[PDB]
Design a protein around this ligand. Sequence first.
Ligand SMILES: CC(=O)N[C@H]1[C@H]([C@H](O)[C@H](O)CO)O[C@](O)(C(=O)O)C[C@@H]1O
Ligand SMILES: [Cl-]
Ligand SMILES: [Cl-]
Ligand SMILES: [Cl-]
Ligand SMILES: [Cl-]
Ligand SMILES: [Cl-]
Ligand SMILES: [Cl-]
Ligand SMILES: [Cl-]
Ligand SMILES: [Cl-]
Ligand SMILES: [Cl-]
Ligand SMILES: [Cl-]
Ligand SMILES: [Cl-]
Ligand SMILES: [Cl-]
Ligand SMILES: [Cl-]
Ligand SMILES: [Cl-]
Ligand SMILES: [Cl-]
Ligand code: NA
Ligand code: NA
Lengths: 670, 670, 670
Amino acid sequence: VPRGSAKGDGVTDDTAALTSALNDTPVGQKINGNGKTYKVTSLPDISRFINTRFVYERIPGQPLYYASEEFVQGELFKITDTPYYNAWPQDKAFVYENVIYAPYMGSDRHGVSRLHVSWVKSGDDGQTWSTPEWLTDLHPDYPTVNYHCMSMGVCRNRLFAMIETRTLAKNALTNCALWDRPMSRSLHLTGGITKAANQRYATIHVPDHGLFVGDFVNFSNSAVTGVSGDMTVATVIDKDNFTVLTPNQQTSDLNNAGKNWHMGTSFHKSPWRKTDLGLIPSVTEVHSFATIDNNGFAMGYHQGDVAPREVGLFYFPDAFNSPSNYVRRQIPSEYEPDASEPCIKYYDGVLYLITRGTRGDRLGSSLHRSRDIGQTWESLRFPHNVHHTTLPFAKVGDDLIMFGSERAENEWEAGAPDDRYKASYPRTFYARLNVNNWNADDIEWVNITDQIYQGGIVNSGVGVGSVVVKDNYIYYMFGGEDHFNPWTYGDNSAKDPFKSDGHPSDLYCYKMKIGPDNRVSRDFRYGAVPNRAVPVFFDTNGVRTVPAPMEFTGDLGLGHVTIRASTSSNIRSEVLMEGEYGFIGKSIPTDNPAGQRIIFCGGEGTSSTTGAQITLYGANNTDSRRIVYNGDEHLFQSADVKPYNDNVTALGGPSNRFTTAYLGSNPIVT
Amino acid sequence: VPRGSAKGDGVTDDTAALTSALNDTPVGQKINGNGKTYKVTSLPDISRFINTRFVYERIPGQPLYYASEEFVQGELFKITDTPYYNAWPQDKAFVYENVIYAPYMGSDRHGVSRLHVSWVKSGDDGQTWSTPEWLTDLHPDYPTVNYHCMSMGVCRNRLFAMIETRTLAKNALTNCALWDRPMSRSLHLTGGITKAANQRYATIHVPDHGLFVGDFVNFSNSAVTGVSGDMTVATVIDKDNFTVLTPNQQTSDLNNAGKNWHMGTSFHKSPWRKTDLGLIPSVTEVHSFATIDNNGFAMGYHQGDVAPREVGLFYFPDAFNSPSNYVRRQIPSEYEPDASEPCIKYYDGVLYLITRGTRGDRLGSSLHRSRDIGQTWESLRFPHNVHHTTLPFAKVGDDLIMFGSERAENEWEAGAPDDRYKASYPRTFYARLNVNNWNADDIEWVNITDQIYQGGIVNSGVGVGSVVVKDNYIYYMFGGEDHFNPWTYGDNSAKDPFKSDGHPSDLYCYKMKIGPDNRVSRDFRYGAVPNRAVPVFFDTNGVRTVPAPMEFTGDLGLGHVTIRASTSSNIRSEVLMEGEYGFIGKSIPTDNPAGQRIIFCGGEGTSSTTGAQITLYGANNTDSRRIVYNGDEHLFQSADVKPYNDNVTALGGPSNRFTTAYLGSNPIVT
Amino acid sequence: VPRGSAKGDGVTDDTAALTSALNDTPVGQKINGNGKTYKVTSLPDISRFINTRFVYERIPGQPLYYASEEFVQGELFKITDTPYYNAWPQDKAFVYENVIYAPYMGSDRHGVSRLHVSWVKSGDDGQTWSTPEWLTDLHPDYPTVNYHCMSMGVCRNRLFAMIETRTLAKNALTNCALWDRPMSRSLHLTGGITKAANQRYATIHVPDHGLFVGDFVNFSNSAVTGVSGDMTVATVIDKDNFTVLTPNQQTSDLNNAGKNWHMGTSFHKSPWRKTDLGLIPSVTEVHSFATIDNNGFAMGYHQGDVAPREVGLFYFPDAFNSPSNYVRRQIPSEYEPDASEPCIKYYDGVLYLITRGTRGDRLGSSLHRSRDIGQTWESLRFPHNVHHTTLPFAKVGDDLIMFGSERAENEWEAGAPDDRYKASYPRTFYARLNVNNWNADDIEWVNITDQIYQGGIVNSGVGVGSVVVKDNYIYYMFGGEDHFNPWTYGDNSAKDPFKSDGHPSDLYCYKMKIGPDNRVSRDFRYGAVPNRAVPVFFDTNGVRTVPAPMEFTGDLGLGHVTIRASTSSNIRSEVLMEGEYGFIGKSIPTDNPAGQRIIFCGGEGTSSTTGAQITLYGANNTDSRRIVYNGDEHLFQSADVKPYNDNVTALGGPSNRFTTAYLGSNPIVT
Ligand SMILES: CC(=O)N[C@H]1[C@H]([C@H](O)[C@H](O)CO)O[C@](O)(C(=O)O)C[C@@H]1O
Ligand SMILES: [Cl-]
Ligand SMILES: [Cl-]
Ligand SMILES: [Cl-]
Ligand SMILES: [Cl-]
Ligand SMILES: [Cl-]
Ligand SMILES: [Cl-]
Ligand SMILES: [Cl-]
Ligand SMILES: [Cl-]
Ligand SMILES: [Cl-]
Ligand SMILES: [Cl-]
Ligand SMILES: [Cl-]
Ligand SMILES: [Cl-]
Ligand SMILES: [Cl-]
Ligand SMILES: [Cl-]
Ligand SMILES: [Cl-]
Ligand code: NA
Ligand code: NA
């Protein structure tokens, strides 16, 4: 009886041939699928294959594709590991001057409680990531409302973000504001600085500087007197020229033409410009960002709280001069039902928009393109009711490359019920769509990594990510959970991140090659002590030393404490107390309450021989509320020595007589 | 002259053919052994092979097997990295509700000094591990005695552990106690809550809840008035039902039949139940844990301090109602000499037990099975005097899969001398034994990873591990060292973990695939800042901020300190001092002792213009033990102003006269 | 038309055949080059190949070689990750008693500002690295001068280092000192301790001990009364024998012949021996270290500030007896122009020296060998003006194996201009040179890894590394940057490491196999919480606990603080203040300045019912500079109660009368 071999044609049922190959092959052999796609009736032991793709209909009629290792050149990274609920990169990521930014929200729940808009960054093309930075503080009216952000990007060297205010109680939108700030840059320039005689201002020529009055500028080597060090923008002449105020003036004009110098800008030392847009009507969320040109950008939006839904974009044609001016452009009405959270990007004059579907039992995600910044559209529907995921994407050559994640295992397919309240392994997919062919009927969703959905609460941090390209690589930054329960149903209904394992959602990044890499590898194994967040050095005496300034805001218990010389040329040790008032007090002792007291001493030991002392006795002391003042001099400066009340307390007593009183006049007795 | 090729039959000496292949092949080629076993006279360059096993008799007559990369689908992880002596997972590991637990002891030595029973956990199937948790405090009678534990596991949703007390001086057992605690869980339930009219208790139906009176229970969405939030168990009716006391009562019966709600339990918020078993006679160590059924479990033990040895188990048939009731069952007497630390597990009605051998020159580890919970046995001896290692194991299909580690290199074989006081690379092995065949004569120990033994002290933390299965993977959690000396013979005879590199022993986990993985990979490269142990966020002002509560128990030196507003709606900054008393004092200055003092001020600066001051002068000050009180009012409230002694000190002096005294009566002169 | 296949002969242009193979092969296939070298006209997609080398002339006439993955058995590791400018391992690395040491300088710039000579270490053959240790403090005359070191190594169990002093302003050398210290060791010895009757000293026989009077020695199990615990060397008899002073004497001679005991030495508990060499004339930098024998060593040097350059070594023939005695030996004059920073090593009686070239447009690096410790030489010039890199190396068999790194991309080649002020991916190379053939004309530089050069400043931390061999592996420890700007041109012209991402330079280690590995792999994936730098344990109450002593030197802000019992059998909590004086003060409140004060209390709460209180009111309080003293007794001990000034302040006032004064005599009125 002849046997068939595996065909790898995506149609022949290769299950039997693959099973026989697995049975007949040692488990450690990597079975090479030769880049082919093999149709199976259930997924085999994928781990034993390389360079293989499977096609499988978990739900009949709904083929999906599954990658073995090395089928794609790609890898998953974990990029945050913090106790907050870290989720929702949607749709904020960007690349600026060689750094990959993964903004997100770190909260305690699906909501704005404990939330900071945050980012981590990579300086090495995604191998390692930075310590989280908070971009927002808690709102001044916390805990009634707090911030939220799903739209951020860069236009002409400024970060722009739609900073929403939402209620803690219901996550209801109450305000939209456009916040923007210059990005930090170092510029290495030749010429461009002039300073007219007999006045103090200098004009600085920097094309497309993106700075406003009051923004930070640092100068080095300018060769123009007074244009030096940390300065600020005094005026903006035009988009290419600004002025600074110098401390001095010369009797000759100055001009550094032909001379090389350096300028620096700063995100951190420049304020946000904040433009209040009010409660923009018919908006639930602002989401995604598409830079259009040197003057403006678009932000996606949807309205989904009441019928009828809207989905579209807001275009800000001149965000520099006119940040409050935008125009609303909706996608066609047929595609607005059951839709939210559009991802938008702009390439070669074409605005592309992809929706999130809200329901697995109704038509789902759709894709739209426009050559007039959303006034008119061409549209298509993805097959099979793609739902619960945003589809962030980039354009690489003729393809859109889009990523999505089911939120819990087995939810992706049309008709699949939600699968919550138990642990599972949700699938993450990508797909390519050729914009010339403009037809998604044949789309191939390829499962490239699986995440964990923890199951302790109904909500999921899996997915809802963001995509960028840098060089020859595409990056999908997105959430994933672990098996550690947050104990919301348990001992942590308050959702305190700092109890036990905190919240399981953290960020990941799938780094996928999308064109040739013409250099030797930069890859390394990380073997260092991570020494950025809390920088420690063993000092020459063998003690761990942290030289960075730090804030500890949580309750602290300390053991033996020494306050070292630190202040005014190190002459003194110093503790400063904030608030309206400071309090230094003494707990009730557990074992010997009768001793409760604090000894304050001007010398090194508890014996009064070492220094003057004042001892404040607690109420629980045998000598309740005593004070003993013990010095070799007691000198009362600047004021009379008085009783607090009138004609109630005495000087001395019958068993505590003063020897005498030295007076410049007899007592005044009344 | 013909040449032979490598046969890969485990018998032909393939040394010459492999040497010629290595010589004739580029060094970067991965030479595929096709899953075969090659007999060699010494190990070749294993790194150049994939999918190859070698058989080699380092000691003639004692073949052992050696895996190249990919021969097994498996990988080693490092899972702790702390300065304690972290060793002895033996034999405590378990999996509970999707989390892998690796309990161990972190001490300063082979002994109970500085010891905490600890664990780390994995929420992602072994890729990453948690911050260590201390399960025990130092014993109340430390430093005479302290805790120790080698037996822990789960029965009916409770953790059970044999918590031993041992002397620091000799590691002698002084007490055994069974400690148990409910495991944390979230349950998503329908119905089961009833509350009878006109009383305050509610009955909660939760099958096999495993809770006792006083244990923590949290309720959400119960739809039963008063059954809400954090509560405790008031009564246990039976194994499936308990009651809680609510704050109120209704005039109608309540019943949430058909309604979905959530319950949570908590390990952390429930006390241990502690059952004192006394000094169980003829016991050296309790070790390993086998869950038997819904009511009880067995724990292994041995007696090895005096002749004759015992090895066996204690069976607790109903640990819930009767934690103090157990029965002792020994293995057959022929297998008790030179034996200790049995590993026990129960599968399909069969109790399996594997011993540790104590000597390489006497019969070693043996394997035993019983169908009556250790009343009768069938037994076999492993060949070649397996010794110095426990053999934790699991049953997967018809095989026992067992793991062991030599403690230092070249100790595994029968007759091999101990190899201590120099650095080496000990071998870790696994083997499979088919329970139907029940014969170990042919057993194949396969070296799958090598560890380091540091050599600075005679003892080794290598090995003595624990095994669990989760899904399609088996996990061996075990110790290994590094080359960093603890300096016991050196500057750290006190064995302080916090000096230099502390102690070199840390935990590892070998994760081995033992059945098909029918999902796309979950694997990631970890590129995040680890931000769980000391969670740091760069605040909006650019300063590292830790929001978690923390305890620093080691001596601290601080620089400039600001105590921020924190307490009573943030009105005040606050420092509280514990102990019988607090002391705030002043070191002897190194450069200017004549200035020794502390200035206390109610305002912001050292100038008295900023606030009232009291300055306590040290004994070394030129103005020795002076006190200066400097305010614009000095008001003595609640008591007379008195000298401490009678008729010894004065008011004023001849060069420090008060202008007058304002009195309500003439002085009382006596 | 026939097509040609790839020849892999290093000469045929294989570009077309490789392009066609890439086009015709799935992207996930690993294309095996069979260890051959393929000539190309530009580098193809290297990532798709394994076991392949390319030869390519980026600059015509200058072939360089490029490795795909697995062509060499090697891997890159990142080994530091700290905010300092971490660079310049040159040329200090060494291996001692199984530990790999990577010394470096951590500063804020190319200069000695903020600099500590530092190291990290590996205890596991390079997989993981330790927390940085500072070897030097800031110089006592900082900020005028600070330390610097490029030469360090081991001779007869002591670390030796050339510790230079240099100016912060210009990095000008002002002093050279030889610093040395015993290395930490544990010795397991038999016999060798004698103690003559009726006196207190014992003689300790330890061959080649390398200890001096005053160095630390610890003894265990000596079997010689009084030779026990932590001791110090009293005398050195000879290189093999020293004495210690014991506390006691016996009437019989003692001798532990035949008895096993343990000795420990300590780097940390022994002082440096510091030998001032003055400002050695005609020296710019001391660099690299070659151990010669049991008595001494050589250190490289160059002079490059004024013409004519020198390059050579200083030989210290007996550094133990005569640390100030050395002899200067130059390389031949033709090789001194445009040369610096020689690397030197000694093998089998031959001293090898390799220079750094300073210019890409003049003859560059050269190699020299000597059989008389630099009195005479044989020499060769590397082709093509190798420049800007040191070439650290080791000898393995008949080959020198040397490593170098361009500092920014595309600088390696002769005639290539410097490429600064923009981000790039510099190439790192190695090469082999057969010492028998002694001809570099044919040398093959193989690009094995690429680094990042950040571009925000002109200088680069890339490269300038150090090489060691351990077992069958060679290790190149060297710098590399990331894309995170230091913001020197920006908001951090002060170069504070602790702002934003600090400085991008960190250390890496390329671990390359250079001979057979006859053991199963030791490799692991690191999945632990790093818990050495700031060791955290979740205590039994669920709070992160750090038991290590620590120093925080940066400004700290704290929230609620509790000072726990810690001192004198835990009777008290304690804070000690250093400096000339301590200051505890109160900020000006932001919201309610009128309340400014500190309440000091001997009990637990702000109510005076809990304890005696003193409240110091700030100047901004409504009751400006008031003091209220509130106790149930006010007892003034040890001194009169006096006004500070004479006949200026009163006792009481008309609305604050004391009831009376209890006196032992009438007032003294004058
Ligand atoms: C925070 C604070 O200032 N507490 C003070 C209280 C409050 O002023 C009073 O309780 C208000 O009702 O009064 C005292 O106990 C008192 O007068 O003896 C002193 C104490 O320092
Ligand atoms: Cl997310
Ligand atoms: Cl939206
Ligand atoms: Cl949805
Ligand atoms: Cl969707
Ligand atoms: Cl201070
Ligand atoms: Cl262990
Ligand atoms: Cl035991
Ligand atoms: Cl043993
Ligand atoms: Cl054994
Ligand atoms: Cl506070
Ligand atoms: Cl460097
Ligand atoms: Cl030099
Ligand atoms: Cl140079
Ligand atoms: Cl060079
Ligand atoms: Cl304390
Ligand atoms: Na350890
Ligand atoms: Na750095």
